[model samples]
Target: AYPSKAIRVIVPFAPGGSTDIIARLVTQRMSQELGQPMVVENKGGAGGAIGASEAARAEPDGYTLSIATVSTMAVNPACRPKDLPYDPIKDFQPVTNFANTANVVAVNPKFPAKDFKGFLEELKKNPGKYSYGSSGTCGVLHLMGESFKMATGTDIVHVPYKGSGPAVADAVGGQIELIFDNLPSSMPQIQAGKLRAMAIAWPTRIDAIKDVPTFADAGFPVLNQPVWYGLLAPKGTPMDVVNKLRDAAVVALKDPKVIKALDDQGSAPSGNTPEEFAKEIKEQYDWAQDVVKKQNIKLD
Candidate 1:
C-alpha cells in the first residue's frame, strides 16, 4: 500500500480535455482508497509532452504519477526519436490501462463525400488534391490519417495542426477537407451539422452514435486503432505502490459512476494490470514505429 504522503497525478493536457476528465474521475476515488489527496496538475502543450516530461523528470518516489497518452508516450518517440527528453519505458512504471476510445473521421458537411466509400473514391479520383488535418505531427489523429492512407492506398495530403481544436476548426470552416480527431471533441460538430462523419476508427460502433459505421464495415479494419490513457508513476516506484494504484484503478473501472462518465465521452472501460499495460505500451510503441517508417511522415 502507499504509505507515503499525498501524490501528484500529472495530467498532460489542458483542464477540460480527455486527460483531465479521466484524471478527475480516478483521482477522487484513488485519493479515497490510498488515504492521500491525489492532486491533479494540468501541464498542457507540446502535444502532451510538456506535462509528461515534467512527470518523467520527477523523483522516482511513488508520489509523482502521470496520465500519459499515445501522443506523449508512443508516436512522438517513433517519429522524433532524437528530441524526446524522457524515456517513456524507463522513466515511468505503468500502473494500469484505465480507458480506451476511438476516433471519428469528420469532414465539412459541404464536402461532397457523404460516406466512407465515397470519401475513398473521391481521394482516388483526385490523388493529392485533398488534405486532412490532425492534432499534431505524430499524434493519434495523425496516425489515423496516415493509416487510412496506407490501408486504402489513397493519396491525400496531410495538414498537421498544433492541436485538434484548430484542426477541427479548420474542417468546420471549410479550410481543411477533413479531420480525424477524438470522438469527444468531434461529436459536438457532428451533432451541430457543421461536419459529417464519414467513418469511425473503432472495431465496433459506439452506442452514442449507433448509426455510424466502423472501418471494419468500410472494408479497412486495419485503420481501427483505439486510443488509450493510463497512469504511470516515475520509474523506481516500489512494486507494492504500483499494486496499490492498480487495485484502485480496478475499483474505479468497475464503479458504475466512473463507467458512466467514461461512456459519456465515448471511452470504453479498459482496466488492466500493470504488466498487461506495459505489454500494451510496448506493442503500441513498436506498431507506431513501423507506421511512421512506412508512411514516411517526417516532421522537422
Candidate 2:
C-alpha cells in the first residue's frame, strides 16, 4: 500500500544545494528497494524554512518524506526559535541519519599559516587585521567561525557572503584571507592548490585529505562534529512505515555507488537507528541553541 504510487521526498532547499544532492543520491536506491519511484520536490526559501514548514504540514503517510540537514533540523530551528514554523523534534519522526560531510577551514595560499596551530597564532597576533568569509549570516559556517574564535581565544572579522560559491571565489581570488566552508565546495580549490586546508571538523581524518588533521586531533574537540543529512516523516507516520523506510535507507547507504558518491563529495555514509539519530539531533539542537544565544546570532 505504501508503494502503490510514487513517493515524494521534500528537500528544504533549492536544487544543487547539498541537501538536494544527498536526497537524490540515496532516494534513488530507496526507490529501487521500495519498488516505486522516490521523487524529489524542491521547495526553497527562508534558509529552508519554507520547504520545511510545508513538509511539516504534509500527510503522515509513508508517501511523503522530508530530507533533514543540520541547517534545517538543528541550526534553523535554533536560530529562528521564536518564529520557526515547525518544531523539528515534534513535527517529524526520525528515520535515520544517512550521511555526513566534513567542515573545513581553508585559507588563501598567500596566508602565512600552514596548520591549525599556526593559524591560531596568527589570528591572535593579528586580531583585527584578519577576517574570514562564511556562507551567510547566522548560518552554520558563521557559527563555526564564531565557535572557533570562542574556543581559541582569538578574534577575526567575519565577512558574510550570500553563499559558499561567492565566499570561495573571494578566498581563491585573495579577496578574503580565510573561509570556513563545507568540504565539498572547497575541496577542489584546496586540491588545486588555490586554497590550503588548515583544519577539518570531523571525527577522523578523511582519506580524501588524509594529511589534514581533524579538529579533535588538533585539540579542538569542541569543533569536531560534521554536518549531517537524514530522513524524516511527519510526526504521526506509522512505525511500520518508518521501519520500512529506514530499512531501505540502510541498505542504500551500503551500496558502493552511494558510498562513492558521498565520498566524492567528502562525505561518509551513516545509517544509525532512528533513536540514535534522534538523540544526536537533540544534542545538536541544544548546542545550536546555546551557540545562537552566546553569539547573539539572529536572522531577523
Candidate 3:
C-alpha cells in the first residue's frame, strides 16, 4: 500500500546523462514491481546542487524521491563544503544503489592519440594544449579529470557542462578534445566511431569494450574508482516505506531486461540494502573530501 500512488523521482541533471539513463532503465521496470508508475523529472545545474536541494525540502510521504550519484552525494559536498544545500548523510533516506558503473576517458575522433599511452604523452607534452569536458565544476567527472592530472603529471583545461550529456555531445562535435564520463551515456557514441575510448576506471576490462584497459592497466591504479547510482527520499521518511522502495529496487535489478541493458552500458546492478548503500555513500564522501583537501580543489 505504500506506493499505491505514483512515485516522482528527481533526476539531478539534464536528460541524456547516465543518471537519467539508469533511472529510466531501472524505474521503468520498478514500476511493474510497485504496481505504480515512477515518474522521472530532469532538474539540471550546479553539479546537482539545485536538484538535490529541491529534493531535500520535499515532504517525506514516500511520494517524492531523488536519484543519488557521486556528484550529488559526494563531490558537490566536498567541493563546495560551505554552501552545499543538502547534507548527503543527514538529509535523505537511503533506498538502494540501483547500479554500479564504469567511467571512461575518451577522446573525440580528431584527437591525435590512438590509445592511452599516446594520449598521456600528448597531454603531458603539451601541458594545456587539450581540454576535457565534465558534467560541471567539482562534479564527479571533473574530479576524475583532476585526479588523473594529479597522478599522471599531465594538464588539461576543464570545461564544465550543465550535465554529462552536453559535454559528451561537445566532445563528439569536437568542441572539446575529450571527456570524463560514465561509460553508459557515452558508449553508444563510442561504438558509432564518434568517440575513441582511452581507458576505463573499473576493476577489469569489460567485454562490451574489450580492448580498453582499466586505469590500473594504464598504470594509474588510483584512477580506478568505480561509480554508483541510487535512490533517496527525504530524511524523515518512515523505515517501512524505505524498505518497500528497496525491495522494489531489488526486483527491478533482478529483471533480465534491466540486467542486459545495464550490461550493454558497461554497468552492473548493485541493488544493495539501504544500510549498505548508506555505507558506500559515506565512504565515497569521505574519499572525495580527502582528495579535495589534498589537491586544493575549489569552486564558486
Candidate 4:
C-alpha cells in the first residue's frame, strides 16, 4: 500500500490496438482507485516481445508492469522456435486476469462467399486464389488463420502487414479477401458496415452480435478459442503487492459500468486469482506451442 511512484504499464503493441485499449481501461481506473498515476509505454515489435522484455527487465517492486495477452505472454515464447529475451513465467509474476477475448473470422461483404462453409468451399475449389491477411506473421490472428488452414486443408496464401490496423484496413477495403482478428479491435469497422464478421472463434456466439454464430456452434467446436488479458509485474514482486493489485482488479471487473464497456466491444469483464491465471497462461502456451509445431507455423 506504500508504493507511491507512478506505475508504468508496458503495452506490447502500438496505440489504437486492442491490447492498448485494455491497458488504458484497466490502468485509468486503477490510477483513480489506487491513488497513483499509471503510465503506459508502447513497445511494439517481435510480436510484442520488445515491450514485454522491457517490462520484464524493469525493477520488480510492483511499479513497472505489463498488460499483455496470450499472444506475447504465452504464444510467442511457447510457439517460436527461437529464444525470447524474457520468459513468461520466469520473468514476471501474474497479477490478475483483466478480460477474455475471442477471435473472429471476417470478410469484406463484397466477397463472393456467403458463409464459413462457402468460404472454405471457394478456397478449396480455387486453391491459392484467395489470400488471408494478418497484423504480423506470428501474432494471435496469424496463428488462428494458420490453424484454420491446417484444420480444413485449405490453401489460402498468407499476407502479413506491419500490424492489425493495416490488415483490417485492407480487408475492409476489399484489397484482401479475409482476416482473423480479435473482435474488439475490429468492432468499429464491422458495425460501420466496412467489414463483415463471418464467425466467432469461440464455442458460443457472443450476445452483442447474436446474428453471427460461433465456429463451434456452426459445427467446428474443435477450433473454439477464448483469449484472455492478464497483468504482470516483474518477477520477485512481493505477494502483498500482487494481492492488493489483484483484489482491486477483481472488484473493478465486477462493476456494471465496466462490464457494459467491455460488452460493447464484444468482450466481458473477467478475472482469476494468481494461481488460476497462471494455470491459464501455461495451458494456452503449451497448447499453442503444440499447434505451432504440428502445423509447421514458424517465424523468422
Candidate 5:
C-alpha cells in the first residue's frame, strides 16, 4: 500500500473563483474515495504562471497533484511560449478532466438587443460601438471573446479586467456594454435580470437558463467550445498512481451529490481517460497558438 498521509492539489488561482470552488467540490468527495485528504492550496499569480511553473517541478509521486485550467494548461502556454517555465504537455501527466464549464456572452440589461439574433445585427450595424469585458489578457475567456469576434464578424472592443467578478459587476452596472464570462460566475446576474445572456459556449441548453441559446444555435459552432477543469500530476508519475486517482475521480463524478453540485455551478461532469484529456489539451493549445499568431495577442 502507498499509504499516503495526505495529498496536495495546487490551484493556480485565488480562492473564491470558479476554479477554486469547483476544485473543492470534487476533491472533497475524492478525499473519501481515496481514503486520504486531498488538500487544496492556492498559489495564484501571473495568470496562473507562478503556481503552474512551481507545480511542474514537483516530484512525480502521486502525493502531489494539481488542478488543470484552460488558462494554465492551454492559454498561458500558447500566449507566453518561451517565457512560460513549464510545458503544458511535456511537464505533466494528465489524470482526467473533472468537469466542463461553459463560457457566456452576456450584456447589461441596458443593451438594446434582447437575444442572439438582435445582438448580432446590433454588432454588425454598429461595429466598434460595443465593448466587452473578459477576465483578463491572455486568459481563457479573453481569448474566447477574441474568437467570438472573429467567428461572428463582430467588432466589439475587448476590455481586460483582473477577474470575472469585477468585469461581471461592470457589465451589470452598464460600465461595459457586455461581457464574455464563465456561465457559473454570471448566472446569478442573468437570473436576477441584471444582465441578459445572448449566447453560451455549451453543447446544449442548460436547464437553469433554457431560453439562452448555445453558440451553435446562434450559428457559430467555432464559439461553442466548452472549457474544462482537469487534473494533472508531474510527468514522471507512475501509471498505476495516475489510474488510481482517475478511478477515484470517476467515482466522485458519478455521485449524485457531486452531480447536483456541478449542476448548481453550471458545469457537467467529465471523467475522461488521461489519453483523451491530453488530446483535448493539445487541441486547445494549438488553437490558442493559432489565434495568438493571427490576432497578435500581446502580453502586458
Candidate 6:
C-alpha cells in the first residue's frame, strides 16, 4: 500500500541551488526504482523553514519527502527563532543522506580583491565597507558569512536574498560585492569568469577550480567541511516505507549518471542508512548549536 501515487519531494530552495539540483538528480533515478514519478516541488522561503515545515506536517505515509540540509536540520534550529515551525528531529524521520556539497566564498570579478589574501586585506582595510549576500537570514550561508567574519576578525555586512540564485545574480550585477554560497550553484559563474572564488571550504582544492585555494589553505580549517543533503519523511512514517525509500535511494546513488553529475559539482553521492543519517543530524545539530551560542547568532 506504500507509494500508491507519485511521490512529492520538496526542495526547500529555488530550482537552481545545489539542494534542488541534487534532489532532482537522485530522485529522478529513484523514481524509476520505485515505480513512480518523484515530483520536485520548490518551496523557497525563510531559509528553508517554509518547505521543511510543510514537509514535517505532511501525512507520514511516505508519499511526501523533503531534502534536508545543514540549514534546515542544523543551523536553522540552532538559531532557535521563536517561530521556527518544526523541530528538526521530532517533526521528521531521516530517510538517507543522498549527497554532500562544499561551500565557497566567491566575489564578483569587479570586486577589489582578486584572491583570498587580497580579499582579507581589503576587508581589514575597510572593515564595514564590503557586504556579502546569502540565501536568507540565519541560513547556512549567513552563518558561514558571520563565521568567516568572526574567524578572520573582519566586519562585512550581510545582504540576505530569497535564494542563492538571486544572490548570485546580484553579485554578478554588482549589487553585492561577494557571496557565501554552495559550490555547485556558484561553480558555473566561477567557471564563466563572472564570479571569482576567494576560497573553497572543502577538504581539498577541487580540480574544477584549481586556482582557488581551500579555506584551510587560507588559514581557516574550520571552514573546510562541506554540507550534506538528505531525504526525510514526516514523523510516524512506518519503518517498512522508510526502508523502501532508503533502498531506492541507495540504488540511485550508484547510478553512473548521478555520480558524474554530483562529481562535476564537487559533491559525492551518499546513501547511508536512516539511523546513520539520524546520528549525522544530531552531530551537526550539536556542532551548529555551539557555533550559534558562541557567535550569538539569532533571528526573529
Best by TM-score: 3
Question: Residue-wise lDDT of candidate 4 within 1-300, one digit each (tens)?
Answer: 545778888888777667877788877776777788889887776677777778889988998889867777667786565677878877889998898887888888888777787877877998888888765666677788877877777878788765566778889888898887778878888889788888887657778777787888667776779787879988899998898788778777877777887887777676788888888888888887787776586544
Q: What are the clashing pairs of model 5?
A: none
List, residue by residue over 89-109, the lDDT tens digit for candidate 3.
Answer: 999999999999999999999
Q: Tell me which residue pairs clash in candidate 3.
A: none
Model 5, 48-119: lDDT tens per residue?
787788889999888888988888888988878777899999999999999999889999998888889999
lDDT of 4: 0.79
Error at 279, model 1, angstroms: 0.4
Q: Candidate 1 residues 1-300, lDDT tens each?
A: 464788888987666556666778877886777788889988776667778789999887788889968887788788668887887887888999888877788888877887888888888999888889877765767777877877888877788766676777889898998888877667767877888988877778888777789888888777777788899988988888888888888887888988887887678888888888888888888888877876574443
Per-candidate TM vs. native? 0.87, 0.86, 0.98, 0.93, 0.89, 0.96
Ranking by TM-score: 3, 6, 4, 5, 1, 2
Which of the two, 3 or 5, has more lDDT?
A: 3
**lDDT order of candidates, best first?**
3, 6, 5, 2, 1, 4
The number of clashing residue pairs in model 2 is 0
What lDDT is reached at residue 7 by model 3?
Answer: 94
Of the pair 3 and 5, which is ahead by TM-score? Answer: 3
List per-prediction Cα lDDT, in the order shown.
0.80, 0.84, 0.92, 0.79, 0.86, 0.88
Q: How accurate is candidate 6 locally (lDDT)?
A: 0.88
Expressed as tens digits, the lDDT of each residue in 148-252 for candidate 2 is 888888888888765576778899998899999878778878888999998888888888888899999999998887888899999999999999999999999
Clashing pairs in 1: none
lDDT of 1 at 249: 83
lDDT against true structure, model 2: 0.84
Model 5 weakest 10-residue run by lDDT? 291-300
**lDDT (Cα, 0-100) at 23 in candidate 2:** 87
Q: Candidate 2 or 4, higher TM-score?
A: 4
Q: Which run of 10 residues does model 4 get worst, by summed lDDT?
A: 291-300
